[PDB]
Amino acid sequence: ACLSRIDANLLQYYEKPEPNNTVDLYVSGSEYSNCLLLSNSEYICYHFSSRSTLLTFYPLSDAYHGKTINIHLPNASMNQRYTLTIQEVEQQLLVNVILKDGSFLTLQLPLSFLFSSANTLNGEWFHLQNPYDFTVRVPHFLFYVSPQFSVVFLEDGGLLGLKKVDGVHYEPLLFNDNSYLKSLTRFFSRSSKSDYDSVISCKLFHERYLIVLTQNCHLKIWDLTSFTLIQDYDMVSQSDSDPSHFRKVEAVGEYLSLYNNTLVTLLPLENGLFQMGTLLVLTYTFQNNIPTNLSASAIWSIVDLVLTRPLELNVEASYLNLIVLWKSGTASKLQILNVNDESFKNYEWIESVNKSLVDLQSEHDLDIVTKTGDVERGFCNLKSRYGTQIFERAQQILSENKIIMAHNEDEEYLAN
Amino acid sequence: SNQYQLPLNVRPYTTTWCSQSPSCSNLLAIGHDTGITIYCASEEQTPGSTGLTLQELFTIQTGLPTLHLSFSSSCSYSEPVYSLFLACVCQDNTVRLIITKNETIITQHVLGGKSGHHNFVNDIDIADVYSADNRLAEQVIASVGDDCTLIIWRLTDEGPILAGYPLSSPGISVQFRPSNPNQLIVGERNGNIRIFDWTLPWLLTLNTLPLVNTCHSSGIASSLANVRWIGSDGSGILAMCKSGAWLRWNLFGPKNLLPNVQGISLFPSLLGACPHPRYMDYFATAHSQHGLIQLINTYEKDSNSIPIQLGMPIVDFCWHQDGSHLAIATEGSVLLTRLMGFT
Numbered sequence: 087a088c089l090s091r092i093d094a095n096l097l098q099y100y101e102k103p104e105p106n107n108t109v110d111l112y113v114s115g116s117e118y119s120n121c122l123l124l125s126n127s128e129y130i131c132y133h134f135s136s137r138s139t140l141l142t143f144y145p146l147s148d149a150y151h152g153k154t155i156n157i158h159l160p161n162a163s164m165n166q167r168y169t170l171t172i173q174e175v176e177q178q179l180l181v182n183v184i185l186k187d188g189s190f191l192t193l194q195l196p197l198s199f200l201f202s203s204a205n206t207l208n209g210e211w212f213h214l215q216n217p218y219d220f221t222v223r224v225p226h227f228l229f230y231v232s233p234q235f236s237v238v239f240l241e242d243g244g245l246l247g248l249k250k251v252d253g254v255h256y257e258p259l260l261f262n263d264n265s266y267l268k269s270l271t272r273f274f275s276r277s278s279k280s281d282y283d284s285v286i287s288c289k290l291f292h293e294r295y296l297i298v299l300t301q302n303c304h305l306k307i308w309d310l311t312s313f314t315l316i317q318d319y320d321m322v323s324q325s326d327s328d329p330s331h332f333r334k335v336e337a338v339g340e341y342l343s344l345y346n347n348t349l350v351t352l353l354p355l356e357n358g359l360f361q362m363g364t365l366l367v368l369t370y371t372f373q374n375n376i377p378t379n380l381s382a383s384a385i386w387s388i389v390d391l392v393l394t395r396p397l398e399l400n401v402e403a404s405y406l407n408l409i410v411l412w413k414s415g416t417a418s419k420l421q422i423l424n425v426n427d428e429s430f431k432n433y434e435w436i437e438s439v440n441k442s443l444v445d446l447q448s449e450h451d452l453d454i455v456t457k458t459g460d461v462e463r464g465f466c467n468l469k470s471r472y473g474t475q476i477f478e479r480a481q482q483i484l485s486e487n488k489i490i491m492a493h494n495e496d497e498e499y500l501a502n
Numbered sequence: 503s504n505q506y507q508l509p510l511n512v513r514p515y516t517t518t519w520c521s522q523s524p525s526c527s528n529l530l531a532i533g534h535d536t537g538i539t540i541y542c543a544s545e546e547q548t549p550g551s552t553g554l555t556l557q558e559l560f561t562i563q564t565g566l567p568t569l570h571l572s573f574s575s576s577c578s579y580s581e582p583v584y585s586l587f588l589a590c591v592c593q594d595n596t597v598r599l600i601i602t603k604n605e606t607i608i609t610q611h612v613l614g615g616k617s618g619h620h621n622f623v624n625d626i627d628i629a630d631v632y633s634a635d636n637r638l639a640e641q642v643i644a645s646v647g648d649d650c651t652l653i654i655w656r657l658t659d660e661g662p663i664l665a666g667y668p669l670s671s672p673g674i675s676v677q678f679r680p681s682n683p684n685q686l687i688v689g690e691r692n693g694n695i696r697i698f699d700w701t702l703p704w705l706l707t708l709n710t711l712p713l714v715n716t717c718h719s720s721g722i723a724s725s726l727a728n729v730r731w732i733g734s735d736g737s738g739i740l741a742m743c744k745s746g747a748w749l750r751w752n753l754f755g756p757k758n759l760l761p762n763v764q765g766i767s768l769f770p771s772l773l774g775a776c777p778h779p780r781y782m783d784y785f786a787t788a789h790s791q792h793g794l795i796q797l798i799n800t801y802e803k804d805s806n807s808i809p810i811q812l813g814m815p816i817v818d819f820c821w822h823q824d825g826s827h828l829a830i831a832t833e834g835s836v837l838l839t840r841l842m843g844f845t
Contacts (some may be wrong), residue, residue, distance in 0.1 A: 203775065214719055219641065235591050311839070347612045411718070451711065451712040451713075451714065451716070452712070453711075454692060454693075455692075456713065456722055456723060457691075457723045457725055458692070458711065458723050458724035458725030458743060458744060458745070459691075459692060459693070459724065459725020459726070459727065459743070459744030459745070460723060460725065460770065460772070461721065461744075461745065461770050463721075463722075463723030463725060464584055464720075464721030464723040464724065465722075465743065466722075467721065467722025467723040468721070468722045471722060493792070494791065495769050495770040495789060495792075497718075497721070497745055497746050497766065497768075497769070497770065497793065500719070500720075500721040500745075501719045501720070501721070502720035
């Protein structure tokens, strides 16, 4: 383990577990969250709520004094954050969201407004729109390509194009699709709820090529100049073709990321295969399958992966680095795959500590410093340790469950 | 229960029986804001409910507060005249030994300033050490404070010998080992527990912090309240946290790998545990703020016994040597209460 965990609760120093400056915008976050870097060198954070009805923004480097903005949505998005995009166009956060009813919502949030004091917003910061009939063919994945262009992926397997003409209106530019004709075979139906080989991951290469990963782990490659299927690789027929079980991916997730012209793909074989080839001209060319090192049955799920330039690790022999984030319940696992050379055959897995020192010390009773004694002493201890957001959320959960402090010295309470 | 009032302007800080010396075990001292008061406990006819009453004998004036108090084995009675030796701590942050004939202080030794503790003194204890010939060779006082120091103060035939020892944290209690004055125990605020041979590194250090059973989390701050030896050979060690968590270790046979037993008082114990002089497995602990006292049995015979509940805060308490009576100083009084079961 070459890395350690440093936990940061951006409100820890302050008594109020919420910023005084919070603004609620309304249109006529504990399920997804991410950061995005902007023109001004500042990081903006965003959260999409459990229901996918609330979007929240706040500045990484000024969470307490800066403004957090809650944007309320009329209904949930069709398929969670997977039907949502956020990109900085020109001094604005452009946010598009296909909603459940079929609407295509556009949000325009000026950069200024995100770092201003204002609790008001002027002008058309949102546009509703119905470009296609999503009642019949339900979409599930929205992918940004450009300020005017971005594609839609459908549950049945089809791609839709979406071209912006003026500043607001969008129109379907359909792609040629003859994949459906496998319906002719006795092994597939159009009407079947199975059989769909929908896209589960997608990346844009050199502005023009659109690399898609399907539920059956096919890598298809679309040329946006042609709007034509250029490539179709079966990722699985390379390694040991197990007739027993290849788990066709049953949800959209982060199963590939590219750096320059390299491309790693996550294939499920005991949840353990990182294929990585190279792109070049368009041609994808295999190099090696790198398994994972995971035990206790292998019950970790990919959260996010990011292929990137090498780090400063204890091994100078490095060419590329894949950062990998697994999850199993609320427990997480961070690993770095180091590839040594341009052959993807020599590599090394680097693990990290997945609990902070403070937490480990508390769990393992290795804390010698924290003052002992009084019941209220323990109160100060825990309050100071955890921060007000958590401490008050915990005191909220207590009273709901009818657990109430008997007296000053209720040790049975503190235990809880 | 029988209740005996302290003088109207007397605020008690500490209460201790003279169990350390059989000649004087019916003597009770109360340290207060102007000195140390001595009472005598006698078997009246009474009803044999509480067949024990308290008679106030006298008051030793010192002119300043007394926070901790310990009789020595040197105490004696004569006809009548009481010859007393008391170790205590005063408002000037000094540690003192006062030798009296009744209320009159005939002799006084004071250890303070820079030569003394350099912060607040948290605890004191005293034992008499005799030579091979068996004259009084030394009287030894041990004390611990917030200056991260343990002080051993020996008063010998050729005069005083002073020694200081550094601590990793403030000293919160200290007590010589029963039947073996060569050994003693020192408690640090941080949970460290030292066994020490002062005649001589120091022999052993246990710690209650990492041992907390955590079936019920004892909390973030579980500052060590008290550690005391138990048994008449000092065969055991008992430690109690402010949180009420307690632990017991024995010292004999074979090899050892954990504390022998562990538990938790119903309430916090600001003053710590007061082990029974006759029943090792038993000790008393107070919820000093609401004025309740729980009685705990180490081998779980107890099942939450709370023989004492006052409607008032408890300042201090201690067992009479007989093991059935309890003396308790509250903010304005001292009670003698007899638990019928221990008779």
